[PDB]
Design a protein around this ligand. Structure first.
Ligand code: CLA
Ligand code: CLA
Ligand code: CLA
Ligand code: CLA
Ligand code: CLA
Ligand code: CLA
Ligand code: CLA
Ligand code: CLA
Ligand code: LHG
Ligand code: 8CT
Ligand code: SF4
Ligand code: SF4
Ligand code: SF4
Lengths: 74, 61, 740, 163, 41, 220, 80
């Protein structure tokens, strides 16, 4: 079981990190802002920071507090 | 057209001052592509405090 | 010619310029535009070549600031004696040293941290001490607590004299250039004045204090009956009882028969098998013998009177056929530039520390350093690292001289010149020597690793298997144990016991026994050699290619410290001469770290542990030459095995090592963030967060900018080394403080 | 009780956990005759430690099998079943602790904003102007709502974006 | 005294002084009110 | 212990997305360099101008995700393993007691498991885990090799090859034997890619050996 | 060979042309400029890629942008 459960977690990790890479290669090349004007893809690029900034809050919240508790418990 | 010293907002898409207020230091009476010259209290990444713009971009407030 | 020649009221002592940060360099005085101005301030604060030009302004700032460091060191020494005064158990240690463990620091009770106070001895609770003050203070004949307060105050008093000297010699009376240009005076004085007199002065302390006192102690008296120090030099008949030759007075010194003093001035060698230290009679005969020799050596430079050498003649009169003009340029380099004279100093004065780490180890010159193993270990690891950094200092500042202070017009067809010219040969050969040792030094473990795991022990280089033995090193130890016969006719015995001598015990502990050099000892030194070469490759390459390399012809004009030139040419990333010091610190770190793991677990294997009478069972039971041949046994027998002391401690006295142990992992792993990442990703991300603060109108007026390239590289090395050294600090102490 | 837990006062391993510490502590202080402060310092900690046990048992924390007191997040659980002091009360304390310094940082940047050069005003604080803000920041919840509804909290749409 | 104040108003000074006022306070709150897990008192 | 870990897991999922969600949205452009649409996809940098752009691209953004991918998966596969170990070994108290503080992870899960693995190559003899005893070392040495590529950047090595291509060129008996393709320090992006390969190949083989040979040594 | 191309935004400061270690950029006279001067890149051959140009542009967003192409004997700057 161990040799399996780890296999499908790692092999699931790489695949998502590739899902986003080709997500970038999309935006870097074959995305067209003209035909997409006002679409749902263009609305996201319209607010980049909100998505970027809030992931930066959640990742810090879990950052300080999760580590902050392990250190306190230590 | 636009006059010196009067405040401005800049709509130029690629810029560090895009949608940021600035004060015209000089406006040329000429046919220059980019006549107007603004000045910003803020600093660019390059350390640049001033730049030239086109009339179609600068808008005075 | 040699005069005092000082200015007056040069600067103005006031706070005017404290309120104006960055006042020194013309670029910083303009106040922060961005957040980097906060960082660019600190890196430029002590760089005095950016501040100013002339050597009058630079040197004054340099000289006046040495008083600062000395004013800090003395507040430090004062503090260490004070905590010996009030908070130490010293008296209790002083009476029963073979048992009580040394302690000074005491922890306030709050926040449940008073558990850090360990039960130690003398009815006391506090932190262990690995520093070794107690085993110095015994050798200085300091008994009561009053001597310590007198040093604490006297040390803290003279510290205040230094800062005044610092103030006085920059603001008020500042020497001129010509004064700092006198080397031959300066060298007559330092060599005779500091080291010559400073040895006599100390040779006069030992004779009238330590020698008498440390005889009354190991004779079995205790500090309660010991006469006060001023009793010794103010009473002859008291002193003459200890050593009868004081009844002879100063006549034997003047009547020119010194064999008279053979009682209190000896030549012995070997360890005193009571305290374990070196016999303290000859240490006085040591400093005395040196002091006489330094004062001699301080007279070889002429100053006013036309007796003694000059420098410029000594150098410029050496010209070989191979070397062209020899040394004609070196004099006006070393008197006209600090970084040149700093690289030379940090070179030796760095590696001198590492040399000390062997001697204080191999022949401990203190009473009872043996019975405390944590102190001998903590002082072998300490001085190596401190000697390790100060070597990389030589690598960094020699590169600073090239880039900045170096001009061709002075040295043409010089020894410096002719080196820059063939540099491609030097670096190339050194680069081959490393690859050579790379496979031979290291690779032989991989053979030993593999041949093990394939179940063929007949192969792995070992003692039973293929013999690789340090012939020469073994052969050296032969001479020195045969030395006190003919090559050393007047002696008690050999210098130290690591040679072919016999074991020595105190308190049921092994002071020092001999050390045997086997195959596993052979294989390691070549790994020491492998690292020491590779880390020379990196620093030398930094010096020779600092000016300009074959691929970047202008490199000097880009400064000492710069990021890449281009992304072009396949990228120039990290080509500068600040960046070869970046790289040298990971090889320094690596080089020295294994120097220790060689030491620590050789010394536990083949020396330390309790004297068992029969068997002399060591700490690890004497597994090294068998235990570690391959990298196999370095995980198991060393890191894994040895680290079961630090991990099991929580709720114990040494538990603070268990926290730091992990805490040094976190800071190390944290470093990788700054080394692996790159700026432009971090500057893009900050662009987003500003949108958040803007949206809330909280935007600061000092614009956040991500760390500069070389900034992120420095803070990357800062932690990688920091977090990595603090582990071994916590790993050693928790180990031995429990075991030793 | 709750979540298969028990109040620490009626726990058992918790009572081991309290009375195993004093034993290991007192057997240690038998090495110091009472004329030594270490006999006093260890004594004072054993009496200090027992105080907290009678405190944790009294206050009603929930110790699981291990005997170590746990907490409970949900308001509907903490509140109704009586112990909210674990988070639910101090989660209010913190916000007023954190927002206070949070909102006191926003006014200072406002007050120091309009000037000749706000930059030097960020390095070197004028503590009086910072004190007037530290004072003014109190009751920020009511002063945040008002900058919220008046429309003065946000900077609206003159922010800068990229593409 | 003019310029001594302006220096004492620099960023790192207050950063030291004012944290050492919290640090001290938060230390002594634990001196009189030890071991505060939950707000129960 | 179950509680505190699921936040680390939750942490790892955000900072992995945070990187990747950034690289996608800034692939088009950001305030620093708003040409990246037309400058290519994977490119080393815009040069040390206007603040010294580095990793400015969207490949370098992805590049940084892997390092977090290998944590948030490492935390999982750890947290899965040592909750189960206790359950396979018949005791729930090794985890939920020592799972809270970070030392048990090191002191209990790592310390006990390592005892069986390191005895494979033992100079006393080969265990049946000597297969994994070796590889567990092969796992580190690759991981450790991976730092040489990630840390040391190119310009240092390009000046070193210069000295060698000079020596081989002017040395005797090797004059006669020369290269067709002039050797050069490999490209900026090429190294990071090579670097992250070693990092992963080493990151996997250690935990692949530790996991298998812990449960093969004990058998739960 | 690298690509280097120049834009309307030039002030003609010459500060690029002073930078190129291979002397690619060369100032061509022009009209619409304030100083009536515009850079230009006759040699895309010898652009090494230093991007010392792009650092020197006083313009807000650059008047020159070097687009790295393939890399030849020259554009690798080989002494070998
Ligand atoms: C079915 C899935 C799938 C498919 C069809 C593609 C297809 C593509 N990807 Mg992609 N990718 C995927 C999954 C996939 N990817 C995943 C899961 C990730 C995350 C890891 C990525 C990350 C990724 C990046 C970052 C990039 C691509 C690129 C590309 C394009 C060119 C690939 C190339 O040049 O490879 C050629 C072949 C190689 C490069 C082989 C290199 C070997 C690699 C480094 C592995 C070496 C480690 C090795 C296994 C160790 C052996 C161990 C042993 C010794 C013990 C192509 C369209 C590239 C692109 O389009 O750029 C414009 C690009 O930059 N992809
Ligand atoms: C061995 C430690 C040491 C020593 C001797 C010095 C010595 C000096 N530093 Mg200093 N410095 C140090 C560590 C040290 N620094 C560290 C660790 C940092 C942080 C990076 C700095 C940051 C720093 C800055 C930013 C500046 C100095 C400056 C100075 C010079 C003026 C000092 C002065 O006027 O104080 C006189 C007053 C006293 C000695 C009393 C000190 C009392 C308070 C509590 C301290 C002097 C040469 C200033 C300068 O212009 O030098 C070029 C300056 O601007 N230093
Ligand atoms: C016998 C004469 C003598 C002695 C003992 C010293 C001693 C010293 N010099 Mg020195 N010097 C001398 C003559 C002398 N100098 C002359 C004639 C010149 C002119 C060329 C210099 C120029 C000079 C420079 C340029 C520098 C020194 C430095 C030093 C210090 C060495 C650094 C160190 O680790 O100190 C170890 C420190 C101790 C062991 C503590 C003892 C210190 C006490 C105060 C003794 C100092 C006596 C000294 C001669 C001053 C006495 C006169 C004064 C009180 C009026 C040391 C205090 C370096 C230094 O530290 O700068 C400050 C340095 O950079 N000297
Ligand atoms: C360098 C430091 C130093 C200092 C300050 C002293 C100081 C002293 N020594 Mg002395 N001594 C020294 C080094 C020193 N010694 C060394 C290196 C030796 C070995 C040769 C001696 C051997 C020696 C002897 C044999 C005697 C002294 C004595 C004395 C005391 C009387 C000397 C006297 O009247 O001088 C006039 C002013 C005096 C306190 C005498 C003493 O202790 O009083 C009986 C005495 O008998 N010394
Ligand atoms: C464990 C990680 C690791 C390893 C193995 C190396 C290895 C090396 N580094 Mg290093 N380096 C590292 C981490 C590492 N580095 C890190 C983290 C940094 C960051 C600061 C650096 C920074 C650095 C610098 C700055 C320099 C080096 C240099 C060197 C080389 C020294 C010459 C040598 O020993 O070659 C001998 C090879 C070995 C010891 C590897 C052992 C492998 C065995 C013996 C051979 C295998 C046999 C066979 C081929 C198997 C393959 C067959 C298969 C294909 C079927 C060597 C290639 C120096 C250099 O190149 O100049 C000499 C140099 O200047 N490195
Ligand atoms: C992510 C959001 C979230 C979630 C999942 C929960 C989950 C829960 N809440 Mg809660 N709550 C939340 C946010 C949340 N709360 C917030 C922000 C408020 C505003 C103050 C409340 C106010 C609130 C009240 C006022 C009540 C709940 C109740 C409950 C329970 C609902 C019934 C149920 O699930 O079985 C019930 C759960 C169990 C039987 C398990 C008990 C677990 C032990 C006590 C621990 C459950 C534990 C109800 C409750 O107490 O349920 C009993 C209830 O009356 N909640
Ligand atoms: C006092 C001013 C102030 C204010 C009002 C804010 C407000 C905000 N910051 Mg923030 N920040 C500040 C200072 C401030 N920050 C400083 C000084 C730094 C670092 C140099 C940061 C670094 C930072 C990052 C990296 C992030 C934020 C984020 C946020 C937002 C979410 C709040 C949060 O979780 O932050 C948590 C806060 C931190 C992690 C660090 C704050 C440390 C303290 C508060 C700074 C010291 C304040 C200062 C000394 C006050 C002086 C008062 C005196 C002059 C009167 C919010 C808009 C996050 C965001 O955008 O999400 C929406 C985010 O990702 N900030
Ligand atoms: C980030 C996670 C986190 C959290 C939630 C806590 C929370 C807590 N820690 Mg803790 N700690 C942490 C991280 C954390 N810490 C870290 C990272 C470490 C290692 C450095 C420690 C080390 C540590 C120790 C060593 C101690 C604590 C203690 C405490 C508790 C006492 C709080 C206090 O002083 O009373 C509240 C204080 C006040 C209310 C004073 C403010 C008074 C003002 C004037 C009120 C004004 C209102 C108007 C508290 C529950 C103490 C304790 O007893 O825990 C059991 C304790 O001794 N912690
Ligand atoms: C060992 C070789 C040795 O000691 O040579 C010493 C040899 C003697 O040099 P000269 O006698 O010309 O130099 C003496 C004086 O010039 C010193 O200033 O100098 C070399 O040519 C250096 C060789 C470096 C080349 C390394 C091989
Ligand atoms: C960045 C990028 C480039 C350009 C285009 C592109 C679309 C590729 C874009 C996006 C890339 C990627 C990979 C985006 C998203 C990835 C991820 C993490 C997708 C995962 C989504 C998870 C989802 C829905 C889960 C939904 C809810 C679930 C299961 C649970 C349902 C249920 C509950 C909770 C209780 C049980 C019963 C029931 C009702 C079924
Ligand atoms: S990216 Fe960082 S490293 Fe690569 S070139 Fe530009 S600056 Fe040098
Ligand atoms: S390119 Fe930039 S620098 Fe060269 S001239 Fe036009 S503006 Fe001046
Ligand atoms: S990059 Fe190409 S163009 Fe820009 S300076 Fe270097 S060589 Fe001249």
């Amino acid at each position: 079981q161990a040799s399996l459960y780890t296999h499908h977690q790692y092999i699931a990790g790489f695949m998502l990190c590739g899902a986003f890479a080709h997500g970038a290669i999309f935006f870097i090349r074959d995305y067209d802002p003209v035909a997409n004007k006002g679409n749902v893809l263009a609305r996201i690029l319209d607010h980049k920071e909100a998505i970027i900034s809030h992931l930066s809050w959640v990742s810090l919240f879990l950052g300080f507090h999760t580590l902050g508790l392990y250190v306190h418990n230590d | 057209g636009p006059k010196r010293g009067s405040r401005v907002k800049i709509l130029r898409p690629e810029s560090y001052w895009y949608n940021r207020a600035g004060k015209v230091v000089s406006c040329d009476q000429t046919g220059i592509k980019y006549p107007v010259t603004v000045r910003f209290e803020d600093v660019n990444y390059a350390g640049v405090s001033t730049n030239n713009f086109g009339l179609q971009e600068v808008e005075e407030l | 010619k040699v005069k005092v020649i000082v200015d007056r009221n040069t600067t103005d002592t006031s706070f005017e310029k404290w309120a104006k940060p960055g006042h020194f360099s013309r670029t910083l005085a303009k106040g922060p535009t961005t957040t980097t101005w906060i960082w660019n301030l600190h890196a430029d604060a002590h760089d005095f070549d950016s501040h100013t030009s002339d050597l009058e302004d630079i040197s004054r700032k340099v000289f006046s600031a040495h008083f600062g460091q000395l004013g800090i060191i003395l507040i430090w020494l004062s503090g260490m004696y004070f905590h010996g005064a009030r908070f130490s158990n010293y008296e209790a240690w002083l009476s029963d040293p073979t048992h009580i463990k040394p302690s000074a620091q005491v922890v306030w009770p709050i926040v449940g941290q008073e558990i850090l106070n360990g039960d130690v001895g003398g009815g006391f609770q506090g932190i262990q001490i690995t520093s070794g003050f107690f085993q110095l203070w015994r050798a200085s004949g300091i008994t009561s607590e009053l001597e310590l307060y007198s040093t604490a105050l006297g040390g803290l008093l003279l510290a205040s004299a230094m800062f005044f000297a610092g103030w006085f010699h920059y603001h008020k009376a500042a020497p001129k250039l010509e004064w700092f240009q006198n080397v031959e005076s300066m060298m007559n004085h330092h060599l005779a004045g500091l080291l010559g007199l400073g040895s006599l002065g100390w040779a006069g302390h030992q004779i009238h204090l330590s020698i008498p006192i440390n005889k009354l102690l190991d004779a079995g008296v205790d500090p309660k009956e010991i006469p006060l120090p001023h009793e010794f030099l103010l009473n002859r008949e008291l002193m003459a009882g200890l050593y009868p030759s004081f009844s002879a007075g100063l006549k034997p010194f003047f009547t020119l028969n010194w064999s008279e003093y053979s009682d209190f001035l000896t030549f012995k060698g070997g360890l005193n098998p009571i305290n374990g230290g070196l016999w303290l009679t000859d240490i006085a005969h040591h400093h005395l013998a040196i002091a006489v020799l330094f004062i001699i050596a301080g007279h070889m430079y002429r100053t006013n009177w036309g007796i003694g050498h000059s420098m410029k003649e000594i150098l410029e009169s050496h010209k070989g056929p191979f070397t062209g003009a020899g040394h004609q340029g070196l004099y006006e380099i070393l008197t006209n530039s600090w970084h040149a004279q700093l690289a030379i100093n940090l070179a030796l004065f760095g590696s001198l520390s590492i040399i000390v780490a062997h001697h204080m180890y191999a022949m401990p010159p203190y009473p009872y350093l043996a019975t405390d193993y944590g102190t001998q270990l903590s002082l072998f690891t300490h001085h190596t690292w401190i000697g390790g950094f100060c070597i990389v200092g030589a690598g960094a500042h020699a590169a600073i001289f090239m880039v900045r202070d170096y001009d061709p017009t002075n040295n043409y067809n010089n020894l410096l010149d002719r080196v820059i010219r063939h540099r491609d040969a030097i670096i190339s050969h050194l680069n081959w020597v490393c690859i050579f040792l790379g496979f031979h030094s290291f690779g032989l473990y991989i053979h030993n690793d593999t041949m093990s795991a394939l179940g063929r022990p007949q192969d792995m280089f070992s003692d039973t298997t293929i013999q690789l033995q340090p012939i020469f090193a073994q052969w050296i130890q032969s001479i020195h144990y045969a030395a006190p016969q003919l090559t050393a006719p007047t002696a008690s015995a050999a210098t130290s016991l690591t040679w072919g001598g016999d074991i020595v015990s105190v308190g049921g502990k092994v002071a020092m026994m001999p050390i045997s050099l086997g195959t596993s000892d052979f294989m390691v030194h070549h790994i020491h050699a492998f690292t020491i070469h590779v880390t020379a490759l990196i620093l030398l390459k930094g010096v020779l290619y600092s000016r300009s390399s074959r691929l970047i012809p202008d490199k000097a004009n880009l400064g000492f410290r710069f990021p890449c030139d281009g992304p072009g040419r396949g990228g120039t990333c990290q080509v500068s001469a600040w960046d070869h010091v970046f790289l040298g610190l990971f090889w320094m770190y690596n080089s020295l770290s294994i120097v220790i793991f060689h030491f620590s677990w050789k010394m536990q294997s083949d020396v330390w542990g309790t004297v068992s009478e029969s068997g002399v069972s060591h700490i690890t039971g004497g597994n090294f030459a068998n235990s570690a041949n391959a990298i196999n046994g370095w995980l198991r027998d060393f890191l894994w095995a040895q680290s079961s002391q630090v991990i099991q401690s929580y709720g114990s006295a040494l538990s603070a090592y268990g926290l730091v142990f992990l805490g040094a992992h976190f800071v190390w792993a944290f470093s990788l963030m700054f080394l692996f990442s790159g700026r432009g990703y971090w500057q893009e991300l900050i662009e987003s967060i500003l949108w958040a603060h803007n949206k809330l109108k909280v935007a600061p007026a000092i614009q956040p900018r991500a760390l500069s390239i070389t900034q992120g590289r420095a803070v990357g090395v800062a932690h990688y080394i920091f977090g990595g050294i603090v582990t071994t600090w916590s790993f050693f102490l928790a180990r031995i403080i429990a075991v030793g | 009780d709750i979540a298969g837990l028990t109040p620490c006062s009626e726990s058992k391993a918790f009572k081991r956990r309290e009375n195993k510490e004093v034993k290991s502590l007192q057997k240690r202080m038998a090495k110091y005759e009472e004329g030594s402060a270490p006999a006093l310092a260890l004594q004072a900690t054993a009496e200090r430690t027992q105080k907290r046990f009678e405190f944790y048992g009294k206050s009603g924390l929930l110790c699981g099998n291990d005997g170590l007191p746990h907490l409970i997040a949900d308001p509907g659980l903490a509140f109704r079943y009586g112990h909210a002091g674990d988070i639910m009360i101090p989660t209010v304390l913190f916000i007023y602790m954190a927002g206070y310094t949070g909102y006191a940082g926003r006014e200072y940047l406002l007050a120091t904003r309009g000037e000749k050069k706000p930059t030097q005003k960020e390095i070197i604080i004028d503590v009086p102007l910072a004190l007037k803000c530290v004072a003014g920041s109190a009751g920020w919840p009511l002063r945040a709502f008002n900058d919220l509804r008046s429309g003065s909290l946000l900077e609206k749409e003159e922010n800068i974006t990229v593409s | 005294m003019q310029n001594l104040k302006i220096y004492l108003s620099t960023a790192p000074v207050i950063a030291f002084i004012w944290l050492s006022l919290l640090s001290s306070l938060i230390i002594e709150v634990n001196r009189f009110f030890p071991d505060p897990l939950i707000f129960a008192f | 212990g179950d509680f505190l870990v699921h936040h680390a897991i939750a942490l790892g999922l955000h900072t992995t997305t945070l990187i990747l969600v950034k690289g996608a949205l800034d692939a088009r452009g950001s305030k620093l360099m708003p040409d990246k649409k037309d400058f290519g996809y994977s490119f080393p940098c815009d040069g040390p101008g206007r603040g010294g752009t580095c990793d400015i691209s969207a490949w370098d953004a992805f590049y940084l995700s892997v390092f977090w991918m290998l944590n948030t998966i490492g935390w999982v596969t750890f947290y899965w393993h040592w909750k189960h170990l206790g359950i396979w070994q018949g005791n729930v108290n090794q985890f939920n007691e020592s799972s809270t503080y970070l030392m048990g992870w090191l002191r209990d899960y790592l310390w006990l498991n390592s005892s069986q693995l390191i005895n494979g190559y033992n100079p006393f003899g080969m265990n049946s885990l000597s297969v994994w005893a070796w590889m567990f070392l092969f796992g580190h040495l690759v991981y450790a090799t991976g730092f040489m590529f990630l840390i040391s950047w190119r310009g240092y090595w390009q000046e070193l090859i210069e000295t060698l291509a000079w020596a081989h060129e002017r040395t005797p008996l090797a004059n006669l034997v020369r290269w067709k393709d002039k050797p050069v320090a490999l490209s900026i992006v090429q190294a990071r890619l090579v670097g992250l390969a070693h990092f992963s190949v080493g990151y996997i083989f250690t935990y692949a050996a530790f996991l298998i040979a812990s449960t093969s040594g004990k058998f739960g | 060979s690298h690509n280097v191309k120049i834009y309307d935004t030039c002030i003609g400061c010459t500060q690029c042309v002073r930078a190129c270690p291979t002397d690619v950029l060369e100032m061509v006279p022009w009209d619409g400029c304030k100083a009536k001067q515009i850079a230009s890149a006759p040699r895309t051959e010898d652009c090494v890629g230093c991007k010392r140009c792009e650092t020197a542009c006083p313009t807000d967003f650059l008047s020159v942008r070097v687009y790295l192409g393939a890399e030849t004997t020259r554009s690798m700057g080989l002494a070998y």
